[PDB]
Amino acid sequence: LPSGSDPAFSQPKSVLDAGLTCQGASPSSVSKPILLVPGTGTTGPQSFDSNWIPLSTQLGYTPCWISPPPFMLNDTQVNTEYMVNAITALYAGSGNNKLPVLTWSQGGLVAQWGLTFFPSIRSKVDRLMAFAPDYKGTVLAGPLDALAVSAPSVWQQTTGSALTTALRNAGGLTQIVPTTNLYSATDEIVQPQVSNSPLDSSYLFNGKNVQAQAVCGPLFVIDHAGSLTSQFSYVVGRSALRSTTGQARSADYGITDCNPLPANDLTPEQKVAAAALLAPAAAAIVAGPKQNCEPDLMPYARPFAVGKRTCSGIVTP
Numbered sequence: 001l002p003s004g005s006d007p008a009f010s011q012p013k014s015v016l017d018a019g020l021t022c023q024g025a026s027p028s029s030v031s032k033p034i035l036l037v038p039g040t041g042t043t044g045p046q047s048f049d050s051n052w053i054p055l056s057t058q059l060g061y062t063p064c065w066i067s068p069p070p071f072m073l074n075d076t077q078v079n080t081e082y083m084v085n086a087i088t089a090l091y092a093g094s095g096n097n098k099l100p101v102l103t104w105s106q107g108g109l110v111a112q113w114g115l116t117f118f119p120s121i122r123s124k125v126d127r128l129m130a131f132a133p134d135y136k137g138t139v140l141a142g143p144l145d146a147l148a149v150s151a152p153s154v155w156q157q158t159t160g161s162a163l164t165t166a167l168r169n170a171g172g173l174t175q176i177v178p179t180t181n182l183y184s185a186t187d188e189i190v191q192p193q194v195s196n197s198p199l200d201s202s203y204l205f206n207g208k209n210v211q212a213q214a215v216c217g218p219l220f221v222i223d224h225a226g227s228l229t230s231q232f233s234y235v236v237g238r239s240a241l242r243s244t245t246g247q248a249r250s251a252d253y254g255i256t257d258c259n260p261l262p263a264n265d266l267t268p269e270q271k272v273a274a275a276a277l278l279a280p281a282a283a284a285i286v287a288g289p290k291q292n293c294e295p296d297l298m299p300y301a302r303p304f305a306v307g308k309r310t311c312s313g314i315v316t317p
Helices: 013-018 044-048 052-058 076-093 106-117 119-124 142-147 152-156 162-169 212-216 231-242 268-275 278-287
Strands: 020-022 033-037 062-066 099-104 125-131 179-183 208-211
Touching: 013 020, 013 076, 020 076, 033 044, 033 052, 033 076, 033 106, 044 052, 044 062, 044 278, 052 062, 052 231, 062 076, 076 099, 076 106, 076 119, 076 152, 099 106, 099 231, 106 119, 106 125, 106 162, 119 125, 125 231, 142 152, 152 162, 179 231, 208 212, 212 231
Parallel strands: 033 062, 033 099, 099 125, 125 179, 179 208
Antiparallel strands: 020 062
């Protein structure tokens, strides 16, 4: 694990702060914040309005969220700066108290990239609840990279990207704070995920790796959005957020919780929005930025991906 000074932010603190919002509070004075880190092609709200914003509310958290522009499609390394700045702020804002981070898709990668590369936020996160995180990225990004039609962040979440190589090589496929990883075999966005083994994209060492089909059976299907919004995911999220250990406890759930439909503590209208969670992100992807190469790694990550090709060319330091 890196253990020096944090890297420099490439964004002005004012830009970063502007992407941080808290329900009914300013970050500088908030009780029991949880930070929500969105998936690819969405804003904080577009990810969590239909799910973890009300769910965290009812569990007695002040939901706060970052919305890195545009729709999490730019450089995961800059989307991470928004998350690091938010953790710094919300820790100080809550009386210097550790906060939980909850995340969907790339939000997980961003989180684990933060804890890998910016040591000062490890003493500020009491736990990480990653919903369908892509730590190895995914192989299903391959066709779109072959077309050279891919957002910066979609290059970086390709399996074998410089970014995913850099993370692994810096010791980033091991948990750095107590970490639960809810995910699904049937994820149509993130693969590989079928092994219920360290082969899976969502798997960390020492982490509470919950593959849905490992608890509910091989006849169980929740998809990429399902892994965030489902009653099953509520129960696992509830479990991790209340655990004295920082991790979901198998003691807290069972076979009768194997419900892939949106969380029952959402309103009927919330359920309907959560059901359709992914369409926004699919659309914002087809609407969004497009380049022919993977964004350069910033100097702090370059030593961990030597040999790989980014926009400037082959990585050397």
